[PDB]
Amino acid sequence: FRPFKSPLPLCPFRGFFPFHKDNAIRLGENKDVIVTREPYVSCDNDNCWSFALAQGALLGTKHSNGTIKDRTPYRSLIRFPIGTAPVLGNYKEICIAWSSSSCFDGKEWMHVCMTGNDNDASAQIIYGGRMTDSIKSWRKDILRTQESECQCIDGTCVVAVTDGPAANSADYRVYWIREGKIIKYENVPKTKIQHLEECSCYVDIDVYCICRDNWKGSNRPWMRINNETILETGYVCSKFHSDTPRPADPSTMSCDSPSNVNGGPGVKGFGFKAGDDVWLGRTVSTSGRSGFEIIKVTEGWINSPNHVKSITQTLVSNNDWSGYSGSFIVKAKDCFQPCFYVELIRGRPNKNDDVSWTSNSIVTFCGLDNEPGSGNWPDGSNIGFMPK
Amino acid sequence: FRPFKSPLPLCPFRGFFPFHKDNAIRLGENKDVIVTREPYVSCDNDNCWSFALAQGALLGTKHSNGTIKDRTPYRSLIRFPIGTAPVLGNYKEICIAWSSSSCFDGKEWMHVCMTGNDNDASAQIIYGGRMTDSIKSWRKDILRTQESECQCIDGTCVVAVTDGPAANSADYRVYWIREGKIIKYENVPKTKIQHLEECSCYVDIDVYCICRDNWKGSNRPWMRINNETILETGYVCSKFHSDTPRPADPSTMSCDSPSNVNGGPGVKGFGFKAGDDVWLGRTVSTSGRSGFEIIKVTEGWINSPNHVKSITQTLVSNNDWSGYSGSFIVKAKDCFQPCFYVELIRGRPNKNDDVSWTSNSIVTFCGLDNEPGSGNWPDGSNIGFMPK
Amino acid sequence: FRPFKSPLPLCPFRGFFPFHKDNAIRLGENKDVIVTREPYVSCDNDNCWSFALAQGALLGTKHSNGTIKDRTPYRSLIRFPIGTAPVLGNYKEICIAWSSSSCFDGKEWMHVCMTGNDNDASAQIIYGGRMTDSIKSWRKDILRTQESECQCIDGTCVVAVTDGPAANSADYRVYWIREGKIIKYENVPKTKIQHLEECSCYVDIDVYCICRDNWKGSNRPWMRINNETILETGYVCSKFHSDTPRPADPSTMSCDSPSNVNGGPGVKGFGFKAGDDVWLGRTVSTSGRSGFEIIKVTEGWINSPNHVKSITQTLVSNNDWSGYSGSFIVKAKDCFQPCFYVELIRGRPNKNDDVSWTSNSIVTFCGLDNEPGSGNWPDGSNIGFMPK
Amino acid sequence: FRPFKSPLPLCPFRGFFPFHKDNAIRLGENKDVIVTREPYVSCDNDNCWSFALAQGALLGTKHSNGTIKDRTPYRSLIRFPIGTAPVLGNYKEICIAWSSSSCFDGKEWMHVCMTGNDNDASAQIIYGGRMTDSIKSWRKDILRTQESECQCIDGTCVVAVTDGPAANSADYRVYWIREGKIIKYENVPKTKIQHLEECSCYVDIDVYCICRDNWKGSNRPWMRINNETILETGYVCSKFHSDTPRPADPSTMSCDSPSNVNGGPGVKGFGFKAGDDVWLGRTVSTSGRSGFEIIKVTEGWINSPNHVKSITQTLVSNNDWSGYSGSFIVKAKDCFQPCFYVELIRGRPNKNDDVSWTSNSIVTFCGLDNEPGSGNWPDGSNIGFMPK
Ligand SMILES: *[C@@H]1O[C@H](CO[C@@H]2O[C@@H](C)[C@@H](O)[C@@H](O)[C@@H]2O)[C@@H](O[C@@H]2O[C@H](CO)[C@@H](O)[C@H](O)[C@H]2NC(C)=O)[C@H](O)[C@H]1NC(C)=O
Ligand SMILES: *[C@@H]1O[C@H](CO[C@@H]2O[C@@H](C)[C@@H](O)[C@@H](O)[C@@H]2O)[C@@H](O[C@@H]2O[C@H](CO)[C@@H](O)[C@H](O)[C@H]2NC(C)=O)[C@H](O)[C@H]1NC(C)=O
Ligand SMILES: *[C@@H]1O[C@H](CO[C@@H]2O[C@@H](C)[C@@H](O)[C@@H](O)[C@@H]2O)[C@@H](O[C@@H]2O[C@H](CO)[C@@H](O)[C@H](O)[C@H]2NC(C)=O)[C@H](O)[C@H]1NC(C)=O
Ligand SMILES: *[C@@H]1O[C@H](CO[C@@H]2O[C@@H](C)[C@@H](O)[C@@H](O)[C@@H]2O)[C@@H](O[C@@H]2O[C@H](CO)[C@@H](O)[C@H](O)[C@H]2NC(C)=O)[C@H](O)[C@H]1NC(C)=O
Ligand SMILES: *[C@@H]1O[C@H](CO[C@@H]2O[C@@H](C)[C@@H](O)[C@@H](O)[C@@H]2O)[C@@H](O[C@@H]2O[C@H](CO)[C@@H](O)[C@H](O)[C@H]2NC(C)=O)[C@H](O)[C@H]1NC(C)=O
Ligand SMILES: *[C@@H]1O[C@H](CO[C@@H]2O[C@@H](C)[C@@H](O)[C@@H](O)[C@@H]2O)[C@@H](O[C@@H]2O[C@H](CO)[C@@H](O)[C@H](O)[C@H]2NC(C)=O)[C@H](O)[C@H]1NC(C)=O
Ligand SMILES: *[C@@H]1O[C@H](CO[C@@H]2O[C@@H](C)[C@@H](O)[C@@H](O)[C@@H]2O)[C@@H](O[C@@H]2O[C@H](CO)[C@@H](O)[C@H](O)[C@H]2NC(C)=O)[C@H](O)[C@H]1NC(C)=O
Ligand SMILES: *[C@@H]1O[C@H](CO[C@@H]2O[C@@H](C)[C@@H](O)[C@@H](O)[C@@H]2O)[C@@H](O[C@@H]2O[C@H](CO)[C@@H](O)[C@H](O)[C@H]2NC(C)=O)[C@H](O)[C@H]1NC(C)=O
Ligand SMILES: [Ca+2]
Ligand SMILES: [Ca+2]
Ligand SMILES: [Ca+2]
Ligand SMILES: [Ca+2]
Ligand SMILES: [Ca+2]
């Protein structure tokens, strides 16, 4: 017997440490590796797992040509051992999906899988391997979700979902799902949040989601949620913004609205509230998806004149490609450990990646209450060695 | 401890939703994937699985040349993770077979595996991995079975078996098998059914099988069976027929006999009775194995002047190849969820599939009591990219 | 908790039925498959497994060249799912070995693994994965064992071992091993048996072993053994001999000594005593390792004028290559089911197998108390398609 | 439920016997095998496992070129079935690491993983798959550890760690870690030990570590440790030295200090104290990493005029390449069985290994209280057959 996961507080931490790295593109030189993108990580009682949206093709084969395309019927959410490259001999196919979220409730896995036509998509809810429920597109404009792990408290899982325009007003909802059955949803209040995509969430008593405003906000919108309702919303106060693109530091302190500067598009990212402070992942570049660093901003969660970047860890150099990033948690006795993954995109449309495909590798870090060292953990592939 | 599966009613449903898709041919471009055909799906307490008849060769190798041939000693029933491509590193060999059925009784797997000479074949019964019993060909003319999952109620499994001509009167039986031991068989009454092949079965209190009349019926024959005997037989009343080939809609309403029009040959297919209504899978083409759709026919299960196609889901376009299709169930608390798979055949003898082999990929859908969206989920292989 | 396996009687049976077939050579065309020989099968509580002596090389690679060689340091006993081809992604390495036996005692696996120099070899005893004991070569002349499953009764496992000349008087012993610890051994009495190699054993209350006389006997020597001692010895009385080479039928009835005709060399084979009758596997050819059939000889176990081949199943045609064969059992409630495997050797030194390597596939059959059909289940590889 | 491992005495033994061998380079001819080095073995309750530092590339691909380099971000500690070659379909990625140690405490696995910049590395502590603690480089000079299994007694695991110069005075510590949490560390006393690297440890009531002095000692330094503190230190008294390089036999008897002859560099190695005697692994060559033998030295553990090599097993000939070697234990009822692995390095910078990569295979032996035979178990690859 296993109990449902509880509303534990986030563990104390003061730095992030290298965890698992798959080197998937390097290992894919001989065409063994499945083409993926939008990876994430999520753990159950026994294992942490890599998840990603496969493209139904092997890296470097003719079918991998043109996998820059975001949505096809040939995409499936797949799962593979954390830190391993996804290959036919080790992967599991979770569901047909070109957008997804997964989370373990303490007893079983839940997955949310969107597929079908852009104007008529549906989200399948999988629980314990069985399709238990669904969401029908209501705005008929690319129904979509987090692309990282959802969160579950006392048996009720929470997941953020969007339907509508990428660069205009759309609908954003949170769904509460218990044992695979949709209990209720709420439209996210628009009193502060103006656009919301690809939420990266974690648990610190309540669920916190830090997301992507793809329209007007170079700062990231956020929500606080429990097993019943949305408790709080806003934008991360930090005058050091963390979307891409974004203005150079220092920028505007906007706790309650989008910055309105360098607003679109964006990239999936994450953060961790720590008291009044906030940790924020971000590309090193302010314009491109290159490099990765995480900063701690003193009093960055609140309205304050005292915002300072007290810590900056540079984990992937600006000379290396990054991509999406997202939070995940690991139960650590009486608290949840904050961890994250970074998608390292290789191929189109990256300048000088002269291949016809698009894929990624993964690297991950976890938070400890110890002082970190330093290093650099990029994709590491010589694109010139790769089958095109 | 696990109890035997019970005679649960079918769950309510109003549409079908995309579940798992393997993209096996696309992923087989580099010769990793095992050549298969006649796939199906069946689940135990912990997992749903893909099953298929392998051809003892890797796709695109010289040994794959000529795998259009239906029966060889080199065919085995194999099992692999649902939605994954079958590769040497993930498959399990269940038994030597060129015709098969599998089902889980709540405690153990049973399999029925036919092999040997066309005139002298035998069916091996496997239970919990042990060969427990057998059936010797009695008409000496290709002893054969469902090519999809059998069904088990309160420990007794039921499976439909045929021996005799493909386009003339043959023998059709149901066998009752408990813990791998044949308890009894019955010759299917011929008062209504005139020819019966490749039954697709499910459970709705009793076992329902919807099969293939390969001789005179463009409508599908069906049986209702419990743990003791055949309770009822007939043909699906729907004036919209669901075999291939078949007449255009609307055709004849024949509850008690074969249509006698476009009667032979046929293709394995499935349906689900829903009150007085019936859901029917079928190729989009009325002549070829191209496309796949599922229709709901109001009062289609009964003798009525009111037959209308209230719902039509087009899941694979008529421009894409399909093949066999079959039902499977997933336990959903106090009811069984109706699901199905579609075999997507590529290679010989499909027009313009210029390769020497014959194989397939798989796609699956499950029923929910929600409104579906729409999409298209075909094999997706560019045959021109494939090793021939 | 699991009890030790008990001394159950052999199940009733009247024919043999096709079980699992791996098609390993066919599937090895693209160099995925590990080079093996001397395969066998053995089962635990949950699964039956294939075992074989690998050659530390992939089929069709340069390192596979010359794998006709019997003993090298690069040979390991490996285990893989029954009926699957052995590949790097599915195999387990049991121990370093160029001769081996394996058996499950009801709780754990035991293995006997010989390796090292021809004149100074040692047998490692593995139990529950731990090396627990060993046998040092005492005649310093290729210490060797069954190349099929040993047998275990009430926790005590029995295994036949040989050290000395291949075509002259050597030492033959049985070892009793409990939980991996050698309890005792006995020199096999030479009052009847004159040469003994590669015993194929099974359980029918007591352990029966039917072996290979490589010197003077075209008939097979046999032993009856319990958990304490050798109870009985002899040669199979059947005037229809079952070694290879051997005289044509009918030959000599020799219950107590070697035939003294077509005496050497031989091939590993098996049989099953059934009352006063005996079932005997044998190559179809009387001179070569081609084809495979199993005969039932009425009163073949005893001294009688009434020996007749009442049954003959031809399972592999004389036009196809065979090789070693061996017995294994599967627990069937209150009796043991008799099964066997046949090694299908391809490559050197088989005439017209124009490749530089030597390997094999596997096929298996089990006994049922039903009448069999007929078929042909040979290796099935087109040697011309294979990498050389 | 499982108890923590206890402080058992080492089992009696009088020779070493061939256990598992992977033949990884031979099997890597077709580019399936992951590039590794610094392998080791460690076991839990159910299985023994191979561990190694992968290089994030497949053997024989372009990315394998230049893998002689010791530290990169693309190295991960990986785990694979003991005696199997590491391939994408069977490996698990444990953590990012270019130096590592692993050990099972009776309940869960602990790992120590160093990565990052040479001057700023950190060691991540993994326990039950979760990152639980860390060590920050304190001398900022390649923080590093055993490259073989650590040891755990009554829930407290012990591991030797080094930071500082390779050929001058550095810092050497032992860390005590319980359930992944660092309890304490001790600086190793320098009253006898002058340099310490790559400890090979085992349990004989207390933990014994036999290590590598890379500076002044051709004899190996050693420590005795319990769950609380370092109990004893020294150098192995044996006048027959066991590092590489080293003086020819007989050399100096130095129980309390480095030999001061042929002092640097060295190679990772191991030994086993047996009463007043000692068993010592060593390369056959006194100058190079070729061959492998194990000697027993009578009274070799103590100050004595009676040192004699009573036993010498030559396991890999001087004509074959060896490399690092290390101890591991297997629980054997009421004692621990001493076993070891030998890394068989192929590629750069080995003379005449004309390839661009560097990797290894593995061979293993275990101790029994029986007399051994003899043999030779080298890597076995024909380097000329390999992709360069
Ligand atoms: C939602 O969970 C609560 C328990 O969690 C607490 O309240 C949440 C809103 C959130 O603030 C958490 O962090 C808190 O720990 C459930 O409340 C229980 O309800 C039962 C039945 O009425 C009652 O017997 C218990 O006393 C309640 N427990 C507590 C701690 O108050 C509530 O039922 C959950 N709601 C849903 C819709 O599932
Ligand atoms: C990746 O694919 C493009 C496009 O391929 C073409 O269209 C595809 C849908 C498919 O039908 C292919 O068979 C077609 O070739 C390739 O670009 C083409 O390259 C060819 C050959 O050099 C050229 O003649 C065409 O004009 C190109 N077509 C377009 C639209 O640009 C491209 O070469 C492929 N990349 C790699 C690395 O193979
Ligand atoms: C077959 O199953 C029945 C129980 O299932 C019920 O009856 C079936 C014919 C079918 O209609 C199902 O949907 C029903 O739920 C077994 O009947 C039981 O028999 C035992 C022993 O006589 C008796 O004690 C129970 O009361 C019966 N249970 C019920 C519900 O009537 C029957 O034994 C099964 N037959 C065989 C041959 O296995
Ligand atoms: C697929 O196989 C056919 C037939 O192969 C021939 O017969 C087989 C049983 C086997 O023995 C092969 O070695 C034979 O080649 C191939 O058709 C043949 O192609 C060759 C070469 O072009 C031609 O000379 C023969 O006349 C053909 N034979 C027949 C009966 O048509 C075919 O080319 C193979 N397809 C592919 C893609 O390789
Ligand atoms: C060997 O096994 C016997 C039990 O098996 C029986 O005797 C064998 C020789 C063989 O004929 C089997 O087929 C029989 O079923 C063990 O005998 C038991 O010994 C214990 C302790 O003395 C005694 O209490 C039991 O009564 C005995 N059981 C029987 C059935 O007689 C014997 O101990 C075993 N010997 C060894 C060395 O392990
Ligand atoms: C299989 O191997 C033989 C022998 O290979 C030679 O000796 C080996 C130990 C190794 O060192 C190889 O590099 C050697 O080539 C091959 O037979 C040789 O073939 C070559 C080239 O045709 C010829 O010049 C030699 O005289 C042959 N040597 C002998 C002893 O016959 C054989 O070709 C290989 N088979 C295949 C299919 O590759
Ligand atoms: C360390 O372990 C001891 C038990 O192991 C014994 O003492 C070690 C130092 C070592 O010599 C082993 O080989 C010995 O077997 C723990 O001692 C126990 O402590 C508890 C609590 O005080 C006490 O109740 C028990 O009696 C002690 N057991 C024994 C055998 O003395 C000790 O707690 C451990 N220390 C740490 C820091 O974990
Ligand atoms: C292994 O690699 C070396 C070096 O490769 C060069 O530098 C690498 C970092 C990478 O950028 C490669 O593309 C470069 O080629 C190879 O040595 C080179 O070989 C080329 C071609 O013969 C030669 O022109 C260069 O001068 C060499 N460079 C150096 C520094 O020596 C080497 O050939 C590779 N080995 C194999 C087996 O492929
Ligand atoms: Ca933005
Ligand atoms: Ca028909
Ligand atoms: Ca003979
Ligand atoms: Ca491959
Ligand atoms: Ca040294």
PDB file of C-alpha atoms in Angstrom, chain A residues 55-180:
ATOM      1  CA  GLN A  55       8.545  12.400 -33.511  1.00  0.00           C
ATOM      2  CA  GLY A  56       7.956   8.823 -34.618  1.00  0.00           C
ATOM      3  CA  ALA A  57      11.353   8.629 -36.282  1.00  0.00           C
ATOM      4  CA  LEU A  58      14.961   7.732 -35.555  1.00  0.00           C
ATOM      5  CA  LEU A  59      17.530  10.542 -35.448  1.00  0.00           C
ATOM      6  CA  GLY A  60      19.460  10.736 -38.715  1.00  0.00           C
ATOM      7  CA  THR A  61      17.080   8.646 -40.791  1.00  0.00           C
ATOM      8  CA  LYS A  62      15.174  10.110 -43.725  1.00  0.00           C
ATOM      9  CA  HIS A  63      11.989  10.257 -41.626  1.00  0.00           C
ATOM     10  CA  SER A  64      13.757  12.606 -39.178  1.00  0.00           C
ATOM     11  CA  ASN A  65      14.028  15.209 -41.941  1.00  0.00           C
ATOM     12  CA  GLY A  66      11.770  18.156 -41.103  1.00  0.00           C
ATOM     13  CA  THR A  67      11.052  17.287 -37.472  1.00  0.00           C
ATOM     14  CA  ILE A  68      11.113  20.989 -36.666  1.00  0.00           C
ATOM     15  CA  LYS A  69       7.339  20.666 -37.212  1.00  0.00           C
ATOM     16  CA  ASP A  70       5.594  20.938 -33.838  1.00  0.00           C
ATOM     17  CA  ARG A  71       2.421  18.924 -34.331  1.00  0.00           C
ATOM     18  CA  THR A  72       1.985  15.674 -36.253  1.00  0.00           C
ATOM     19  CA  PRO A  73      -0.064  12.470 -35.743  1.00  0.00           C
ATOM     20  CA  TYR A  74       3.266  10.652 -35.409  1.00  0.00           C
ATOM     21  CA  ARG A  75       4.167  12.262 -32.102  1.00  0.00           C
ATOM     22  CA  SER A  76       3.736  10.270 -28.893  1.00  0.00           C
ATOM     23  CA  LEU A  77       4.581  11.030 -25.301  1.00  0.00           C
ATOM     24  CA  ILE A  78       7.335   8.510 -24.481  1.00  0.00           C
ATOM     25  CA  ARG A  79       9.085   7.570 -21.239  1.00  0.00           C
ATOM     26  CA  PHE A  80      12.625   6.318 -20.740  1.00  0.00           C
ATOM     27  CA  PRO A  81      15.097   5.782 -17.869  1.00  0.00           C
ATOM     28  CA  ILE A  82      16.261   9.156 -16.553  1.00  0.00           C
ATOM     29  CA  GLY A  83      19.605  10.154 -18.029  1.00  0.00           C
ATOM     30  CA  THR A  84      19.431   7.494 -20.767  1.00  0.00           C
ATOM     31  CA  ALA A  85      19.050   8.183 -24.482  1.00  0.00           C
ATOM     32  CA  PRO A  86      15.612   7.174 -25.797  1.00  0.00           C
ATOM     33  CA  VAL A  87      15.981   4.062 -27.955  1.00  0.00           C
ATOM     34  CA  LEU A  88      13.549   1.466 -29.264  1.00  0.00           C
ATOM     35  CA  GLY A  89      14.900  -1.052 -26.774  1.00  0.00           C
ATOM     36  CA  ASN A  90      14.247   1.081 -23.688  1.00  0.00           C
ATOM     37  CA  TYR A  91      11.317   3.392 -24.342  1.00  0.00           C
ATOM     38  CA  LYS A  92       7.661   3.087 -23.412  1.00  0.00           C
ATOM     39  CA  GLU A  93       4.929   4.820 -25.409  1.00  0.00           C
ATOM     40  CA  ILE A  94       2.568   6.574 -22.997  1.00  0.00           C
ATOM     41  CA  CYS A  95       0.006   8.032 -25.405  1.00  0.00           C
ATOM     42  CA  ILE A  96      -0.422   9.792 -28.725  1.00  0.00           C
ATOM     43  CA  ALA A  97       0.451  13.414 -28.026  1.00  0.00           C
ATOM     44  CA  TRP A  98       1.880  16.630 -29.426  1.00  0.00           C
ATOM     45  CA  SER A  99       1.460  18.357 -26.062  1.00  0.00           C
ATOM     46  CA  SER A 100       1.607  16.696 -22.655  1.00  0.00           C
ATOM     47  CA  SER A 101       1.953  16.667 -18.900  1.00  0.00           C
ATOM     48  CA  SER A 102       2.590  13.783 -16.509  1.00  0.00           C
ATOM     49  CA  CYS A 103       2.501  13.397 -12.737  1.00  0.00           C
ATOM     50  CA  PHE A 104       2.471  10.620 -10.131  1.00  0.00           C
ATOM     51  CA  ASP A 105      -0.128  10.905  -7.358  1.00  0.00           C
ATOM     52  CA  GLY A 106       1.554   8.526  -4.913  1.00  0.00           C
ATOM     53  CA  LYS A 107      -0.247   5.477  -6.295  1.00  0.00           C
ATOM     54  CA  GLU A 108      -0.545   5.819 -10.090  1.00  0.00           C
ATOM     55  CA  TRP A 109       0.664   7.895 -13.037  1.00  0.00           C
ATOM     56  CA  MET A 110      -1.608  10.434 -14.702  1.00  0.00           C
ATOM     57  CA  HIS A 111      -0.916  11.829 -18.162  1.00  0.00           C
ATOM     58  CA  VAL A 112      -2.549  14.525 -20.259  1.00  0.00           C
ATOM     59  CA  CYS A 113      -2.089  13.990 -23.996  1.00  0.00           C
ATOM     60  CA  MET A 114      -3.252  16.387 -26.727  1.00  0.00           C
ATOM     61  CA  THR A 115      -3.516  15.262 -30.340  1.00  0.00           C
ATOM     62  CA  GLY A 116      -5.577  15.704 -33.503  1.00  0.00           C
ATOM     63  CA  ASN A 117      -6.246  18.709 -35.739  1.00  0.00           C
ATOM     64  CA  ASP A 118      -5.195  22.188 -34.655  1.00  0.00           C
ATOM     65  CA  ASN A 119      -8.827  23.325 -34.710  1.00  0.00           C
ATOM     66  CA  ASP A 120     -10.381  20.228 -33.125  1.00  0.00           C
ATOM     67  CA  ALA A 121      -7.858  18.692 -30.731  1.00  0.00           C
ATOM     68  CA  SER A 122      -8.681  16.658 -27.648  1.00  0.00           C
ATOM     69  CA  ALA A 123      -6.752  15.933 -24.474  1.00  0.00           C
ATOM     70  CA  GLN A 124      -6.834  12.325 -23.305  1.00  0.00           C
ATOM     71  CA  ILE A 125      -6.474  11.736 -19.567  1.00  0.00           C
ATOM     72  CA  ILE A 126      -4.573   8.532 -18.773  1.00  0.00           C
ATOM     73  CA  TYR A 127      -4.566   7.092 -15.246  1.00  0.00           C
ATOM     74  CA  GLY A 128      -2.851   3.838 -14.283  1.00  0.00           C
ATOM     75  CA  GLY A 129      -2.487   3.194 -17.993  1.00  0.00           C
ATOM     76  CA  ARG A 130      -6.210   3.508 -18.697  1.00  0.00           C
ATOM     77  CA  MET A 131      -7.840   6.334 -20.643  1.00  0.00           C
ATOM     78  CA  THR A 132     -10.240   7.722 -18.041  1.00  0.00           C
ATOM     79  CA  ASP A 133     -11.425  11.105 -19.318  1.00  0.00           C
ATOM     80  CA  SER A 134     -10.874  13.799 -21.935  1.00  0.00           C
ATOM     81  CA  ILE A 135     -11.000  17.513 -22.703  1.00  0.00           C
ATOM     82  CA  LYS A 136     -12.443  18.729 -25.993  1.00  0.00           C
ATOM     83  CA  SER A 137     -10.942  21.866 -27.534  1.00  0.00           C
ATOM     84  CA  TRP A 138     -13.322  24.715 -26.669  1.00  0.00           C
ATOM     85  CA  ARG A 139     -11.583  27.612 -28.451  1.00  0.00           C
ATOM     86  CA  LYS A 140     -10.563  25.339 -31.344  1.00  0.00           C
ATOM     87  CA  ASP A 141      -7.031  26.762 -31.455  1.00  0.00           C
ATOM     88  CA  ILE A 142      -4.295  24.324 -30.409  1.00  0.00           C
ATOM     89  CA  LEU A 143      -5.468  22.984 -27.053  1.00  0.00           C
ATOM     90  CA  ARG A 144      -2.192  22.555 -25.161  1.00  0.00           C
ATOM     91  CA  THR A 145      -0.561  22.029 -21.782  1.00  0.00           C
ATOM     92  CA  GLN A 146       2.572  22.289 -19.624  1.00  0.00           C
ATOM     93  CA  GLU A 147       5.232  20.127 -21.329  1.00  0.00           C
ATOM     94  CA  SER A 148       6.483  19.325 -17.832  1.00  0.00           C
ATOM     95  CA  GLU A 149       5.185  17.563 -14.733  1.00  0.00           C
ATOM     96  CA  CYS A 150       1.825  18.369 -13.195  1.00  0.00           C
ATOM     97  CA  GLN A 151       1.385  18.136  -9.423  1.00  0.00           C
ATOM     98  CA  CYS A 152      -0.815  16.007  -7.162  1.00  0.00           C
ATOM     99  CA  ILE A 153      -1.908  16.683  -3.597  1.00  0.00           C
ATOM    100  CA  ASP A 154      -3.899  14.246  -1.462  1.00  0.00           C
ATOM    101  CA  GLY A 155      -5.046  12.423  -4.587  1.00  0.00           C
ATOM    102  CA  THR A 156      -6.076  15.473  -6.582  1.00  0.00           C
ATOM    103  CA  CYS A 157      -3.833  16.384  -9.488  1.00  0.00           C
ATOM    104  CA  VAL A 158      -3.647  19.893 -10.929  1.00  0.00           C
ATOM    105  CA  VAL A 159      -2.735  20.811 -14.509  1.00  0.00           C
ATOM    106  CA  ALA A 160      -2.686  24.070 -16.497  1.00  0.00           C
ATOM    107  CA  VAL A 161      -4.233  24.020 -19.967  1.00  0.00           C
ATOM    108  CA  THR A 162      -4.511  26.613 -22.767  1.00  0.00           C
ATOM    109  CA  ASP A 163      -6.671  27.014 -25.875  1.00  0.00           C
ATOM    110  CA  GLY A 164      -6.469  30.017 -28.198  1.00  0.00           C
ATOM    111  CA  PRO A 165      -3.991  32.446 -29.843  1.00  0.00           C
ATOM    112  CA  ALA A 166      -0.235  32.362 -29.222  1.00  0.00           C
ATOM    113  CA  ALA A 167       0.160  36.155 -29.373  1.00  0.00           C
ATOM    114  CA  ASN A 168      -3.265  37.429 -28.345  1.00  0.00           C
ATOM    115  CA  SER A 169      -5.877  36.877 -25.637  1.00  0.00           C
ATOM    116  CA  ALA A 170      -6.617  33.161 -25.153  1.00  0.00           C
ATOM    117  CA  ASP A 171      -8.291  30.950 -22.551  1.00  0.00           C
ATOM    118  CA  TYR A 172      -6.163  29.561 -19.713  1.00  0.00           C
ATOM    119  CA  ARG A 173      -7.549  26.998 -17.299  1.00  0.00           C
ATOM    120  CA  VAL A 174      -6.505  24.814 -14.425  1.00  0.00           C
ATOM    121  CA  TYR A 175      -8.067  21.344 -14.264  1.00  0.00           C
ATOM    122  CA  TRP A 176      -8.430  19.300 -11.089  1.00  0.00           C
ATOM    123  CA  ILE A 177      -8.308  15.578 -11.799  1.00  0.00           C
ATOM    124  CA  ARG A 178      -8.755  12.743  -9.313  1.00  0.00           C
ATOM    125  CA  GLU A 179      -7.916   9.153 -10.234  1.00  0.00           C
ATOM    126  CA  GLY A 180      -8.092  10.208 -13.880  1.00  0.00           C
TER     127      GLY A 180
END
